[PDB]
Write a protein that binds this ligand. Structure first.
Ligand SMILES: NC(=O)C1=CN([C@@H]2O[C@H](COP(=O)(O)OP(=O)(O)OC[C@H]3O[C@@H](n4cnc5c(N)ncnc54)[C@H](OP(=O)(O)O)[C@@H]3O)[C@@H](O)[C@H]2O)C=C[C@H]1[C@H](CC(=O)O)C(=O)C(=O)O
Ligand SMILES: NC(=O)C1=CN([C@@H]2O[C@H](COP(=O)(O)OP(=O)(O)OC[C@H]3O[C@@H](n4cnc5c(N)ncnc54)[C@H](OP(=O)(O)O)[C@@H]3O)[C@@H](O)[C@H]2O)C=CC1
Ligand SMILES: O=C(O)CCC(=O)C(=O)O
Ligand SMILES: [Ca+2]
Ligand SMILES: [Ca+2]
Ligand SMILES: [Cl-]
Ligand SMILES: [Cl-]
Lengths: 412, 411
């Protein structure tokens, strides 16, 4: 009779074809059933340029205040984009910026449809990657070494005691490159807690990967912190659910994951999580069918995003009124994951039911054979797909909407 | 009369535990009956590395520079438990890391494929060869704990006496943590590029380099720029003539594209990525342990072929108690065959070249005929379904290879 009152959500609008899909999702799938107190931040490239990227920081601050953010894919400028949009600077990726402000762990997991074939034969249960969202390469200082000379890294305590100087390399034959990077104890502790809690929440074992055989001090610190927290705070809960936590060397881990059946949480350092989550998503059948949710250290704030790109080539055709077949699932599940968290915070049973029903309809629709071109290509091979094998962007969104209406009405 | 092949000079690095047992069996049953060698042997077992404060590892690397061919048995890389088990003077670094740091070059890794061993990744009908840059980055880094608030900086002091340059790494104001510095060398990157372009041209396959230059714009940008300059100026015409190409890819794009591909390309990897992704790729072809690993040095004349991965401690303990084991020797065998094949190339030795290939063929044919160790039978049937009649123990398998090798060499 009346729409679900859904509460406060921070929306981060994006670019190009994902921006188009984003507005379709709202128009056809969300707003006909849900009324929201939407706090909207335009992270389009033109508004980021207009505001000297201030809108991105304001959006992150709004997520802290309202505890739920949902983010559309954005352009990370390069030189070509600077020329295309006459940018004032080559602005940094909003995702890096938001993650650095909020902190936490990005959990990434495939979105699985029975008729979309896996590439890895054994993966019959899901693999959830928890990517530490702070530090390491993403805050590093790198530079070109122009010629022979010495590179050192130093630590000067703030409390006035004596410095320590570590030789990096004496460049004796030429130049090269060098870099320093760091991470913080508290961030690592938050990463550990989020990983143990996720594993207990799903009832799956947890592995952390490092390369502490080589980086005995840097990666040893991750290994040590996880083990201490596990022993003192989570081990008895794990044993009660008959699950476990173990550290693994990263190269052992990627091979162990390859040969596994799935069904574990995989805690990754920032870089490894960035890389391995794409490998895993592709192994489940489609790189694009993936959820990506930043879980912040306060245990109450979340940011759900559509991972990967803005699909520029489809946007160019759309702008010319040409037919496209853009997969909206990752954008839809950014909304449903955000709304499901909003519902849990508010004990809003109607919104929780809605968010889960939309995820069900999305998967059921694809499983009934209605699907965009990229998914049909998973089944038949891309050079072999014909027009009758798939739905265009609007046909697919319309089929979702008609299936969502049926699902919500049947439950009433 | 009856004669053996005159094989020439080879540097041998002996190793630890079960791989050491297998190593000696390979020489005794498979190499020495057919090949005479000028063997320059270095004991890289954990006890002798400790006794020499790791000097033997350096001596062995220097011997490879002299004789241009090394073959290496798997070695223990000590952890806390190994330090206690052998009362070590230090948690010594991996010998492979030390040797690679001394020799430099590119480590090429590739699956050893048997028709009856199923892949885990559906589309991989052709091989993926990873060229792992073998020098620098995380494997020569300096890392440390930050015990509390304070400033970490990194500074460059030019040799020529001009003014030093200092960059702020991090101001720790809320606690402690960790930090590290790493580096790489232009000349080493250039050698890595040359080896990668030459390997692609020798195979007739395209070449991809992965980096994360979106994030490390100077450090990884330097890899990208050196590769592109060397390509444009020295190899692009030859690539186009063979209808292949070179392209840079972001590492997270590359791992997904690799997993969705059919194979058939060279994948140039920075040290860390090559270490990690070569294990993923070998496992994806069916068996982590079936892989070749050959360090190709920058001089274009020196190689070190290694048995990659572990020493199979659990089998070694069983062996020490007189219990039956089923230890796969293929990776150790192919270290010898790849080393001898390069030796044959340097010396223009057709007999040695024929032998090295024959041993590889015998190894593959034997497994494809249904004679293998337990690990491989588990690839086919699933470990819970493997019975004794599904496999050969360690000595039965080596003897089967011996008999098939004798037959093959009788043309
Ligand atoms: N690095 C990326 O990937 C990211 C992309 N961006 C921007 O997005 C724009 C374009 O990016 P691009 O690389 O051009 O990819 P795109 O999204 O166009 O997809 C290529 C082809 O895949 C097919 N395809 C893709 N999606 C769909 C779909 N939904 N439905 C159907 N087909 C699809 C289609 O195929 P076709 O049908 O055309 O044959 C398309 O063309 C640039 O501004 C980037 O900055 C944003 C963030 C990064 C993040 C990290 C970060 O910076 O914060 C990241 O991942 C990393 O770097 O770590
Ligand atoms: N490198 C060195 O390797 C040593 C240990 O490495 P680790 O990481 O323990 O891996 P291991 O080399 O010890 O192998 C561990 C397990 O994998 C199986 N396995 C490994 N290699 C073979 C083989 N060649 N044939 C058959 N089965 C095999 C065995 O499984 P199972 O025991 O189930 O047969 C073994 O117990 C370390 O000390 C390190 O320094
Ligand atoms: O070198 C080591 O420490 C173990 C061997 C290894 O990791 C490898 O061969 O890839
Ligand atoms: Ca990425
Ligand atoms: Ca390794
Ligand atoms: Cl359309
Ligand atoms: Cl035996």
């Amino acid at each position: 009779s009346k729409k679900i009152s859904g509460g406060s959500v921070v929306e981060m609008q994006g670019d190009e074809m994902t921006r188009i899909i984003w507005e379709l999702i709202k128009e056809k799938l969300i707003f006909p059933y849900v009324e929201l107190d939407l706090h909207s931040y335009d992270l389009g490239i033109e508004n980021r340029d207009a505001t000297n990227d201030q809108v991105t920081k304001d959006a992150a601050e709004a997520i802290k205040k309202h505890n739920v953010g949902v983010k559309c894919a954005t352009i990370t400028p390069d030189e070509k984009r600077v020329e295309e949009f006459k940018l004032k600077q080559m602005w940094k990726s909003p995702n890096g910026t938001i993650r650095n402000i909020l902190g936490g762990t990005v959990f990434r997991e495939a979105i699985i449809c029975k008729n979309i074939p896996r590439l890895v034969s054994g993966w019959v249960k899901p693999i959830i990657i928890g990517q530490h969202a702070y530090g390491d390469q993403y805050r590093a200082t790198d530079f070109v070494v122009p010629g022979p000379g010495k590179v050192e890294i130093t630590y000067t305590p703030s409390d006035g005691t004596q410095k320590v100087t570590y030789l990096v390399h004496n460049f004796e034959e030429g130049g090269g490159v060098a870099m320093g990077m760091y991470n913080q104890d508290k961030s690592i502790e938050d990463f550990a807690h989020s990983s143990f809690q996720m594993a207990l929440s799903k009832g799956w074992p947890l592995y952390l990967s490092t390369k502490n055989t080589i980086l005995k001090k840097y990666d040893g610190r991750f290994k040590d912190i996880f083990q201490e927290i596990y022993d003192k705070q989570y081990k008895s809960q794990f044993e009660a659910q008959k699950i476990w936590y173990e550290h693994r060397l990263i190269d052992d881990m990627v091979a162990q994951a390859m040969k596994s059946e799935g069904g574990f949480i995989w805690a990754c350092k920032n870089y490894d999580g960035d890389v391995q989550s794409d490998s895993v998503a592709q192994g489940y059948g489609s790189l694009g069918m993936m959820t990506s949710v930043l879980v912040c250290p306060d245990g109450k704030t979340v940011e759900a995003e559509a991972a990967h790109g803005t699909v520029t080539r489809h946007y160019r055709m759309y702008q010319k009124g040409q037919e496209t077949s853009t997969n909206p699932i990752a954008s839809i599940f950014a909304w449903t994951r955000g709304l499901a968290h909003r519902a849990k915070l508010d004990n809003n049973k109607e919104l929780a039911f809605f968010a889960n029903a939309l995820e069900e309809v999305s998967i059921e629709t694809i499983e009934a054979g209605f699907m965009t071109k990229d998914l049909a290509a998973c089944i038949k091979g891309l050079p072999n797909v014909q027009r009758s094998d798939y739905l265009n962007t609007f046909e697919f969104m319309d089929k979702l909407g008609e299936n969502l209406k049926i699902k919500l009405a049947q439950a009433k």
